[PDB]
Amino acid sequence: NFRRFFSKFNVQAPAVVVLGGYLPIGENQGVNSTWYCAGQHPTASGVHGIFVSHIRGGHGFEIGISQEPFDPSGYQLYLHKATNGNTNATARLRICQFPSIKTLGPTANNDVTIGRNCLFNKAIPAHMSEHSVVGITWDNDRVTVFSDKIYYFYFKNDWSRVATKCYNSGGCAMQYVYEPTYYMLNVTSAGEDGISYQPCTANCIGYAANVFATEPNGHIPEGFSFNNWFLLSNDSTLVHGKVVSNQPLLVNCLLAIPKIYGLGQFFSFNQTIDGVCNGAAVQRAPEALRFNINDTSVILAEGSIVLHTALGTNFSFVCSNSSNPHLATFAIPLGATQVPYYCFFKVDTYNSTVYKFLAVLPPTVREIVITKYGDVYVNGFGYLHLGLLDAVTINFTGHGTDDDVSGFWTIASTNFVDALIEVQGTAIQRILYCDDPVSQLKCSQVAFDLDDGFYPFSSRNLLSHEQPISFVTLPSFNAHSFVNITVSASFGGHSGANLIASDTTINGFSSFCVDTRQFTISLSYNVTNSYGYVSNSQDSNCPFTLQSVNDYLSFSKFCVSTSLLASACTIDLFGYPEFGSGVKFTSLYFQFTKGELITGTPKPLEGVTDVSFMTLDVCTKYTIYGFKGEGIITLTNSSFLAGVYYTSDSGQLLAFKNVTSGAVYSVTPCSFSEQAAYVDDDIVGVISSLSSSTFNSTRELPGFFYHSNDGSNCTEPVLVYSNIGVCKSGSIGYVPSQSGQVKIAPTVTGNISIPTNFSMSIRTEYLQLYNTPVSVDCATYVCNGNSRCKQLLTQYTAACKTIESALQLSARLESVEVNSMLTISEEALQLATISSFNGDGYNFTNVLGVSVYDPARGRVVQKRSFIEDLLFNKVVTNGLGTVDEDYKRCSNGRSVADLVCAQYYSGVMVLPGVVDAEKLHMYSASLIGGMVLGGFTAAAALPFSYAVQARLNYLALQTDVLQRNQQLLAESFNSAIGNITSAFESVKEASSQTSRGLNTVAHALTKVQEVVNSQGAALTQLTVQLQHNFQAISSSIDDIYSRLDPPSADVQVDRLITGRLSALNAFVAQTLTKYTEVQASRKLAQQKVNECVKSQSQRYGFCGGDGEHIFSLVQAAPQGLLFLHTVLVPSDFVDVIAIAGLCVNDEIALTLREPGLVLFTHELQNHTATEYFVSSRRMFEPRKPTVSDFVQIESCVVTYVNLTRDQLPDVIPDYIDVNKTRDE
Ligand SMILES: *[C@@H]1O[C@H](CO)[C@@H](O[C@@H]2O[C@H](CO)[C@@H](O[C@@H]3O[C@H](CO[C@H]4O[C@H](CO)[C@@H](O)[C@H](O)[C@@H]4O)[C@@H](O)[C@H](O[C@H]4O[C@H](CO)[C@@H](O)[C@H](O)[C@@H]4O)[C@@H]3O)[C@H](O)[C@H]2NC(C)=O)[C@H](O)[C@H]1NC(C)=O
Ligand SMILES: *[C@@H]1O[C@H](CO[C@@H]2O[C@@H](C)[C@@H](O)[C@@H](O)[C@@H]2O)[C@@H](O[C@@H]2O[C@H](CO)[C@@H](O[C@@H]3O[C@H](CO)[C@@H](O)[C@H](O)[C@@H]3O)[C@H](O)[C@H]2NC(C)=O)[C@H](O)[C@H]1NC(C)=O
Ligand SMILES: *[C@@H]1O[C@H](CO[C@@H]2O[C@@H](C)[C@@H](O)[C@@H](O)[C@@H]2O)[C@@H](O[C@@H]2O[C@H](CO)[C@@H](O[C@@H]3O[C@H](CO)[C@@H](O)[C@H](O)[C@@H]3O)[C@H](O)[C@H]2NC(C)=O)[C@H](O)[C@H]1NC(C)=O
Ligand SMILES: *[C@@H]1O[C@H](CO)[C@@H](O[C@@H]2O[C@H](CO)[C@@H](O[C@@H]3O[C@H](CO)[C@@H](O)[C@H](O)[C@@H]3O)[C@H](O)[C@H]2NC(C)=O)[C@H](O)[C@H]1NC(C)=O
Ligand SMILES: *[C@@H]1O[C@H](CO)[C@@H](O[C@@H]2O[C@H](CO)[C@@H](O[C@@H]3O[C@H](CO)[C@@H](O)[C@H](O)[C@@H]3O)[C@H](O)[C@H]2NC(C)=O)[C@H](O)[C@H]1NC(C)=O
Ligand SMILES: *[C@@H]1O[C@H](CO)[C@@H](O[C@@H]2O[C@H](CO)[C@@H](O[C@@H]3O[C@H](CO)[C@@H](O)[C@H](O)[C@@H]3O)[C@H](O)[C@H]2NC(C)=O)[C@H](O)[C@H]1NC(C)=O
Ligand SMILES: *[C@@H]1O[C@H](CO)[C@@H](O[C@@H]2O[C@H](CO)[C@@H](O[C@@H]3O[C@H](CO)[C@@H](O)[C@H](O)[C@@H]3O)[C@H](O)[C@H]2NC(C)=O)[C@H](O)[C@H]1NC(C)=O
Ligand SMILES: *[C@@H]1O[C@H](CO)[C@@H](O[C@@H]2O[C@H](CO)[C@@H](O)[C@H](O)[C@H]2NC(C)=O)[C@H](O)[C@H]1NC(C)=O
Ligand SMILES: *[C@@H]1O[C@H](CO)[C@@H](O[C@@H]2O[C@H](CO)[C@@H](O)[C@H](O)[C@H]2NC(C)=O)[C@H](O)[C@H]1NC(C)=O
Ligand SMILES: *[C@@H]1O[C@H](CO[C@@H]2O[C@@H](C)[C@@H](O)[C@@H](O)[C@@H]2O)[C@@H](O)[C@H](O)[C@H]1NC(C)=O
Ligand SMILES: *[C@@H]1O[C@H](CO[C@@H]2O[C@@H](C)[C@@H](O)[C@@H](O)[C@@H]2O)[C@@H](O)[C@H](O)[C@H]1NC(C)=O
Ligand SMILES: *[C@@H]1O[C@H](CO)[C@@H](O)[C@H](O)[C@H]1NC(C)=O
Ligand SMILES: *[C@@H]1O[C@H](CO)[C@@H](O)[C@H](O)[C@H]1NC(C)=O
Ligand SMILES: *[C@@H]1O[C@H](CO)[C@@H](O)[C@H](O)[C@H]1NC(C)=O
Ligand SMILES: *[C@@H]1O[C@H](CO)[C@@H](O)[C@H](O)[C@H]1NC(C)=O
Ligand SMILES: *[C@@H]1O[C@H](CO)[C@@H](O)[C@H](O)[C@H]1NC(C)=O
Ligand SMILES: *[C@@H]1O[C@H](CO)[C@@H](O)[C@H](O)[C@H]1NC(C)=O
Ligand SMILES: *[C@@H]1O[C@H](CO)[C@@H](O)[C@H](O)[C@H]1NC(C)=O
């Protein structure tokens, strides 16, 4: 049955969980089984658990558990009930130094007397249902009993041996357990019903949400919940954001432990921890092991956590509901998580036993992490610090037995690692380790996903620095002198707060001047306190400290005087006795000038007449003629005769001369900047000045080297930059010069070509219309609401006023421009829906938007088009425009503020966009319906084919309008619309974006993405400036005004006011640039819609590239319009012989009136019958000539066709001969 047994694990009804431990192992499934169910009385060894599965009315039952060594000193368990009284059948149990009953019997053959020493020899009730299961499990000196509840007892034992007496019950009555098993409870209802257990295999462990399988490299597998893995923090916890921090998240081993079992284990920071790691174990000694639990009752037991320091000191962890270990008793009379618990560490050594206070235990402890270097965290807060730990012991107490096996409580052997952390709601949700060079680049910025582009990357340096030290100065006769400066004082007096004497001498004198080239300071303290020790501190008001002068500092002169000296910087020495007199010693005055005459040394340098020493062609830390730096020194062929050390015009050291031999050595940095080509979420290529790197292929561009994994040429550049383009596979190649559409220049005669077989193509263009109006409160942003700071701010006059003035002026101008810009006609809107609009052959389904009666307050809603859905949802980070937060609830203050309120509390308020996406979509639909609105009323809803025909006739008169003539154009338009939709649907899939560049969908969507990102990026960059401390005491103005007196505080706060105001001014400057840029785009859109959408354009190439523009339609876009310019492109050209004009009988010249009209001979009758046709020069539309198309000219030319009055009517059928007709 087993329903009741798993029902004893109190679990919520609709939850599915994973079981573990020494559970009953299934009647038949697996090897398992082997229920005895008969009085055979078997014997086994190494058993870790036994069970009884069926109570057939209360049959007899006997248990004998002992040690395999058969020791007499150990405790033996023997449970005996040879009774069938059910309720009265109270089972006899004797946990004693007890008869190790070998086979069977109340006493039987054994050793040890019955009652030599007993811990429990009472009677226990043993009545339960037939399907009830009772069992006992022992492991790690912990014993668990399943008698109607999951009991738990700590008991030092070794119970690998068991002997039983059995009575038959249903064929499966009692059993042993040797190894842990698992189960899957698909619970659906409370009680014994709706449980639906099933057997298991090693795959169930990963199914638990709070445990994971460690990757072989030690990283957390993706998708982990991080339910309780709080990020560690010494001072404060971030509530929402992204942080790159050094945290112990690189786990070596994860020990999933069932909640019903406690853990007693020795953990050392010097050895790989034991236990069965769920994932791929790493044989590395932990430095930070993280414990995950469910309830505080596990830890509250005294001595649960014992920390052993490297010195051997032990810290016993004690929790109690009192406060004074020294003056109160900590024997706990309370439990069940009642009242706050005050937890301490009891220092245990036979010198002095003191208690160190951790913190008030929170009402719910979920993760405690203990690391070496002496640091312990509770719920992600570093309450207490210690010295270097080396070992930790854990003595836990199972769980609360009221909700168990809801997975496992786990402990993780982790190592510190710098990882990018995404946290929202003060809880982790995803992580990214900063080890992979791609991951290193990602952690260089703060982002998990990076758009395609070139990102700066630093050349990898030597991981082991081991840098030799270089030091070069002028040659001179070597000479070293020690300057010691001995200070003599006697402090303390009475009670340690008095003084007696104080004096100092410099080499036995009150003043000294260094004459030898080398010198080394060595301060000595001849100070004695009558009360104890003297604490010494050193001041500094010089470019150097006493410890720093020995670091190869160079001077022309260096004189030290204990008294005031002219032009001498001051350094003071402070002496602190045990009780803190706080007085200072004599001030040290250092008069010095820059030069190479003398140099401080840490030790008298070797060498004769020259002390310089340096290492060639190795990344080294150098001090060259006072120029401290790190770089590579290489001998070069330069022969600069003058000078000693050479520097660029910017003051950077370039090369220095050996002077002794005349050789010069160039100084270059150890590492050089590199550009990493990051496309398709991977590093595919690196632009570097180095000749080689960790890539199998390397191509040398004229200006730089390029390393990648693909040496082939790149012909389809996914990403372009400067003169080069990079493919998605890492290939590099020059961008080919795309050949544009050919345009035929008009001419009066000779061979010409008339384009034909026109097919239309849609070219997409996006133009931004407006920006989100941002109004920042300058006063509250700068002063942070501090009244006393506003008085100082007022001294800056209009610097604060002009910011908001310009911001509001720009916002109002943009608002009024776009408001007067958007004109909407309701009649056009009527014809803009699928039911009304009728595109015969033209598929406008992807372009039009449906309209339904909205139940929301009745007002009808017109859903935006499918293309608009694709453009908005897939790009907008918030999904919808209504997500823009409102400030009505922002001042409530009853909930923790989010990012919007965080920036609003600093005076930054974001006004809603001037026009909603709904209004923009209705405007686009209005334009689409108006391009087919043939009359002032709705009764003139022309079919789109008629509008297309009219627009075709506008640019070239159609002489043969057949059905297929429009059908081919309609088919081409439908195909191009399908291509556009496929391109919008997804990137580089279902629509090959190999055709990429300007006037394409990819460029438009990249522009939309950058537009929607820049507005947030600027605001975040503004808000982060508040964190900066502009060389003041602190970033908090009230903190400054509290630490300092009013005079100095005003000076200090003025530093940040200038810093914040300059940062605020920088934001305005970039927004005005954005406003200026968007104004030009908006002005073009007004020109674009009038000259392309509301009417076809005679301007060549204005509406979406070259070709004959037939029409264009507009779709709503984020903060702008997406123009879809439909343009005709020819597929073939007809070659005909143009005619300049006609001259009949050499007496009347006759030429074409229309400049954009040609006359030619075509087809079979071009030369066999000499037939003449006229047509537009834009499209091939042959038409017989008419007298209205011809004009008379006073004179002829040679190029004109030579005809006679009889032949002319053949050329011009409409011509009539007045003389011939009248004379008949
Ligand atoms: C809360 O505040 C506590 C301080 O009370 C911080 O504790 C520090 O934790 C860091 C680790 O995050 C400790 O840094 C480690 O120091 C070890 C020993 O330091 C000696 O050796 C280094 C290197 O030679 C010397 O520079 C140093 O002066 C000491 O002489 C190092 O061995 C560790 O090396 C690890 O990092 C390096 C990279 O730097 C890796 O290459 C190594 O492989 C290794 O992984 C490490 O540098 C620091 O000592 C702790 N300080 C104290 C006083 O204990 C907590 O980190 C802080 N917590 C938070 C969340 O802020
Ligand atoms: C865990 O339990 C859930 C809940 O279902 C309940 O518990 C099961 C153990 C059974 O005893 C169910 O009778 C009981 O309602 C299981 O979800 C259930 O899965 C089954 C398929 O295995 C669903 O049956 C099908 O459902 C589809 C869609 O409704 C129908 O078209 C089919 O004709 C067929 O009926 C069943 O609907 C579904 N329960 C509910 C409430 O939707 C679940 O499979 C089980 N195991 C795991 C691993 O979760
Ligand atoms: C038709 O088109 C023009 C029109 O000329 C007219 O028709 C001719 C048949 C003659 O009867 C012309 O007298 C008449 O105006 C013809 O173009 C003509 O081409 C000839 C040469 O092929 C030109 O003569 C030249 O004149 C220059 C001096 O200007 C001399 O130096 C040359 O040696 C040569 O003789 C003549 O000027 C020119 N006419 C005009 C008006 O430019 C054309 O040849 C004729 N036939 C065809 C097939 O087009
Ligand atoms: C690990 O933790 C367990 C759980 O607290 C510790 O067991 C506890 O040890 C104390 C000290 O002996 C026991 O107190 C004594 O109990 C006996 C009855 O057994 C009583 O007669 C004494 O007067 C005294 O109160 C306590 O009962 C016992 N808890 C349990 C559940 O058995 C254990 O000592 C810890 N071990 C280490 C190494 O830290
Ligand atoms: C220990 O883990 C369990 C789950 O893994 C959690 O404790 C349990 O929390 C649930 C609700 O979160 C409690 O459910 C309640 O049960 C009562 C009894 O029927 C019911 O009337 C309520 O409506 C509610 O459903 C459940 O009792 C509780 N189990 C306990 C406390 O044993 C929690 O994550 C951890 N417990 C603690 C105290 O932190
Ligand atoms: C700058 O150029 C000078 C001159 O070329 C370099 O001086 C050279 O230094 C080396 C090492 O000190 C001298 O080697 C000699 O070796 C003998 C035998 O072991 C030893 O007895 C000498 O005391 C000396 O060490 C070398 O003669 C000397 N060159 C001279 C004097 O012309 C110098 O190393 C170069 N670099 C710097 C940073 O000064
Ligand atoms: C004009 O464009 C519309 C765009 O909606 C075309 O209508 C849709 O055409 C597809 C052809 O693949 C139909 O097939 C499939 O339908 C399933 C279920 O609706 C859908 O999940 C697929 O993604 C795919 O769309 C689709 O049923 C049909 N109707 C829709 C999407 O509502 C139409 O065929 C084009 N040509 C005309 C109207 O002549
Ligand atoms: C701190 O605790 C450790 C162990 O908890 C003590 O080390 C034990 O010392 C006894 C000495 O009689 C040995 O028999 C044990 O084997 C040691 N245990 C371990 C794990 O090594 C240590 O003495 C304690 N130190 C103080 C100052 O209390
Ligand atoms: C270009 O114009 C010439 C005359 O202006 C056309 O005449 C061709 O002239 C060549 C030269 O001998 C002959 O071989 C061809 O047979 C002529 N073609 C015709 C149709 O008369 C020529 O056809 C025009 N087109 C091209 C491509 O040259
Ligand atoms: C402590 O560890 C020293 C280093 O050896 C290794 O240490 C860690 C990194 C693990 O890899 C461990 O398995 C190795 O032993 C030892 O030299 C030293 O003896 C160790 N000390 C003690 C007391 O075990
Ligand atoms: C800690 O909590 C105790 C509550 O326990 C109750 O009182 C004791 C005396 C026993 O009778 C026990 O059975 C009860 O449940 C308080 O009595 C005690 O004062 C608290 N500690 C402090 C310092 O206030
Ligand atoms: C237990 O013993 C009492 C006393 O004789 C009796 O009345 C009762 O029925 C017994 N119960 C069972 C379950 O045997
Ligand atoms: C410290 O100065 C006192 C003052 O004369 C002197 O007697 C004593 O010897 C000095 N001690 C040292 C270590 O210099
Ligand atoms: C300075 O102290 C050093 C030892 O630190 C000693 O060798 C040297 O002789 C002392 N010089 C003087 C002038 O006291
Ligand atoms: C210096 O001259 C040598 C010999 O002519 C030559 O091998 C070397 O490449 C030259 N180096 C530079 C930097 O000019
Ligand atoms: C790749 O480009 C280079 C530079 O133009 C050219 O020499 C080479 O032939 C190209 N590769 C192939 C396979 O044509
Ligand atoms: C291209 O135009 C020529 C001449 O007008 C015509 O014969 C041919 O069929 C056209 N091509 C197609 C694919 O219709
Ligand atoms: C994409 O374009 C090709 C050629 O222009 C066309 O055959 C295909 O039908 C288009 N795809 C869609 C979905 O219209």
Numbering used by the authors: 31 to 1254
Copied sentences from the primary study:
The trimeric spike (S) glycoprotein of PEDV is responsible for virus-host recognition, membrane fusion, and is the main target for vaccine development and antigenic analysis. The S1 subunit can be subdivided into three domains and two subdomains, namely the domain 0 (D0), the N-terminal domain (NTD), the subdomain 1 (SD1), the C-terminal domain (CTD), and the subdomain 2 (SD2). The D0 modulates the enteric tropism of PEDV by binding to sialic acids (SAs) on the surface of enterocytes.
We further obtained recombinant S protein of the PT52 strain using the porcine IPEC-J2 intestinal epithelial cell line, which is the native host cell line for PEDV. Refined maps of D0-up protomers with CTD in closed (e) and open conformation (f) colored by individual domains. g Superimposition of the CTD-close (green) and CTD-open (purple) conformation S protomer models depicting the motion of the CTD. While the identity of the PEDV receptor is currently unknown, the CTD motion observed in the recombinant PEDV PT52 S strongly suggests its involvement in host receptor binding.
